[model samples]
Target: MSGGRFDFDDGGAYCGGWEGGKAHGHGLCTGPKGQGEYSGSWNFGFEVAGVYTWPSGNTFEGYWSQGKRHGLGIETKGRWLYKGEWTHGFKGRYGIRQSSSSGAKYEGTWNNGLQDGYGTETYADGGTYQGQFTNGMRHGYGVRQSVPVVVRSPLRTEAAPFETTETYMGEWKNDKRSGFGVSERSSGLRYEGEWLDNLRHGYGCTTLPDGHREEGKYRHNVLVKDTKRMLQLKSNKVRQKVEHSVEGAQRAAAIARQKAEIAASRTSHAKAKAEAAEQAALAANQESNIARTLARELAPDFYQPGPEYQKR
Candidate 1:
């Protein structure tokens, strides 16, 4: 009825063991997981130096105290000796040991050995990946199929077959996609790109069914970068200043980079578009200085927005 106090010899369960009111020696406890054995000292009905075997074929061969998972031992997933804490899944934290058959293993922070917090997971494929994990799968702003951004609802109808079409096929956090993904529209124009807090961000590409395409750069889904990437990369300080002066210009927005080039006789995907506006903005600083000085003297009335100076 009780434990470590009595002995039962009639059923052969009393050999070198105790149960309710007798003293033998060895003791055992069979439970849902496995059987636990003890062969050391007992205090007023407390167990110590016990060996426990779990139903999952895991065994704890080590020291115990007072029926609780205390002290140290070699926990094994078959043959590997894991020297760590084995709290019988009742403590706040425990190390995980997956068997080779199950092809499962964990070696990091765990909440009751169920794969929680930062840890490394070894799958059945003999591949091991380490990063932030929640519950049992990859999650958070981490690599290897784990990111915080999510996808929006409703499938987008795209004009092309290469376009993505799924309920939640974007940047994922855990088993679900939590970042931006694209859906095609019936009109052929499709949305494709980043998602932040369940909303579009940074930039995205869209293509029409007729083959026209525009992969506009956006900040929070608002058009941020378009024909500005080149201007931003320009070394001309004055050009950069002028571009920033433009109303609604984003800070460090994607500037369309380029150099003036005529349409070559041979057509190719690498052809550069005529950057008429950008080219004027991209003039070297020395040239800009000369133009400014000439404008201040000869064309004083031309740049009234600036300072006033006499002509030559």
Candidate 2:
């Protein structure tokens, strides 16, 4: 009794290291409060670092400061297991929380006991999420993928078993498909576009395995209208306009050059004809004058006028 403090409350006992005759260093506390036992370091009668056993077969073995769990620790309760750093008894910093009952687990950083920051969460159904999380949810940018489970044929035929894997890559909110993303299923169906609460709710495109593609506004994952045809026509029209602009300019230039050459040739031919006609007229006039002079000389005395009278 002198080595440590001994206190009995309703048949429960507390016995361990003491300081000034009180439980102050390391000790053991057993009580009926939960049919539990605690054995660890103590400070002024507070469990600092040690193990605690609960009535439900749960246990906690870790660090503590001033009666509050802090630093590294491990806790096992029923179907759940938590191992990681703690901040004032909260699952803070980095940690791994798994569920044996569901065969699911989460490994990542935590903030105030919630899943936050970059992390990976695996489901019991063979699905996984790798991305950012917010408030214990799959949020922001991330990817969710599911692997199909193998199943035998319903008819029990000779065909072998088969399974398909589906995947979604993009934004998420509250564990649902929100914002923009792409979902590709095992059935050769794919959706890439905006979403709202796990459904396609805005502009996007879907492609089938059979080379068929649908592009348009979507509501609840259904194509409201076929916009691909109209968009295709618009694109073609724009392309044609762009392509013909340069060609049209070149064609006009060629035509104008040809017309100019033809006009110049016609002008040259007309000038040559005018010059030839002028020369022919001058020769005719000269011949006529010479004939008249010869006649006058032959009939000088036969009523022919003299050179001075002809000149007058």
Candidate 3:
């Protein structure tokens, strides 16, 4: 079985294959530059299977398609395995990446090779934001919520016997009384608010170490609720109720005044009627005397005036 050339790179690289082949299948090869080694199934001297070791002590094991690292090859550069990124080329889908070193990550749509389109990012301290990223720096609307993560010292945190017990709580996230939250700080202080990515935002009202309290609104990361100290704010419910009662009382008073005026007018007319009746009775008796006197003059009979018997 006579064969053609059994070599790569003009003749610097050499290999053996099937009798009638050109480094055709199932063979071993060494690079021309003495930089690499391959032992695997071969298609015309190109590796289709098995291990390839580079001069730098880097190696690849598993399937190779057309001389390219493909189908389950674990490549390690230094100490980090290509830890977990897409090993193969991405056709049109996006990619999101994260690194635990600094707790940094990129969540966005990708194009070809760069991070394009909208994305969100976060810091290790639970401060996070989302927006459009052209090549990285925030290029659109985003929100960053962070709080003064107070990490109390062990002396001030651990619960000891007669140590005026302290609290050591774990992480909190997403507006919840989560992680190992505590309320026994000073026999007093309490906290309430919203949390995202383990940081507080939105409406937060807290009773602090002192007896004082702070209540406010939040936007992105800024305090937006501004309360005035000198302002005497009234309870809305109480104010509304008072207003309605006052109006009702005013209407009632107006009706009472009208009734009193009518009663007074009626009493005045009754008194006038009583006085007229007394005067009419007196006048009738006097008129009877005058009539009696006139009738006595006209008839000279049946007329008698009684003014003591001696005068008659």
Candidate 4:
């Protein structure tokens, strides 16, 4: 444990070079626990390059900084491999990881050893996803594509590949659709609504190919029956029926009122004309009587008859 070179009583030994009583130059140390070994440049007794391994079959063969994985590196756990940037010995900052056991591969930015930021994942079953991330979960915008299948054809010697494309675009939370999004299917159907845990859990509208559609509250993709709007529609229909009957009676009463008004106006006009004619006839008779009385009072007709008898 000093400058130059030395060995522990546990059978582990260190060799190569040193500085300031610490392993600072090129060196190699056989793991004391038979865990593995480290052979590389050492900076204050920390591995900076070369290979390091553990008894559990885990290994790292890349950069290190202040006893932590940093810079560019590759980590292996059985068949799984993660190769890319590192921060403080974790699969963080950014990297690409592949899991042969699960048949999935990912390449994206990471944070504190979790998938975060943006990335792309390809599944073994021909499905692929690419988009934003948060805390190792697909909790943001993204796109997913499904696998295509082979369809047999009788008219041709070879089978045709029928690719069915389905996709979702919108907000997400904890790997589930939790906000606004649009889900489309290959069967000419679609659902655009709010989601929770991958199920339709809020208000949305669903459309079908056969001219059928529904827009209302939903939970787990099923329409909520007897909802307020649904019942309101029914009540509106009933009210319309009642209003139709009342409108008929009202229309008849309105016509009768119009006819009575017309008749009353005609009678009033006729009475006014008859009163005007009677007053005119009375004035004419009074004028004629005055003229006859004036002739009798003057007596000019009797004086003319006496003069004619004397001339004869």
Q: In order, what lDDT does every prediction score?
A: 0.39, 0.61, 0.40, 0.57
Candidate 1 colliding pairs, count: 28
Error of 4 at 252 (Å): 56
Every model's Cα RMSD, please?
33.5, 52.5, 54.0, 52.8
After superposition, candidate 4 runs with Cα above 4 Å error: 1-5, 9-11, 101-103, 147-165, 225-230, 233-312
Which sequence of candidate numbers ranks them by lDDT, best first? 2, 4, 3, 1
Total backbone collisions for each predicted model? 28, 0, 1, 0
Q: Best lDDT goes to which candidate?
A: 2
| Top TM-score model | 2
Q: Which one wins by TM-score: 2 or 3?
A: 2
Consecutive 10-residue window with the lowest summed lDDT within model 3: 303-312
Superposed by TM-score, candidate 4 places the C-alpha of residue 12 at a distance from the truth, in angstroms, of: 2.8
The per-residue C-alpha lDDT of model 2 at residue 306 equals: 20
lDDT of 1 by residue, 1-312 (tens): 333222234321211234455532333333322222233333334544544445445545454554665534455555443444445533214344446466656554445545555555566655444444567664542222111125564455354465322122334366332454443444555555555554556455545778765545555557655543534555644323333322112211111000001101111111111122122223222232433343344334332211111110
What TM-score against the true fold does each predicted structure earn? 0.39, 0.65, 0.36, 0.63
Candidate 2 local lDDT, 1-312, one digit each (tens): 433334476644565556665566555566753246565666677766666666555666677676666776677777887766678988766667789788698767678899887666779986877677789998777667797225755755555775578877766779888776777888898776667899887666677988586666667867675543445565444334323432432343343334334433433433343343234334323432332343334333222122222233
Q: lDDT tens digits, residues 1-312, model 4? A: 333435667755655456777776565555563335554566777766544556555656566788787766666677687767668888755566778588787766678899877666668776766666688887666655563225565545445764466665555678876666666677767666666777776666566856466556666867663223344665444334333423432443343334334433433433343243234334323432332233234333311121132233
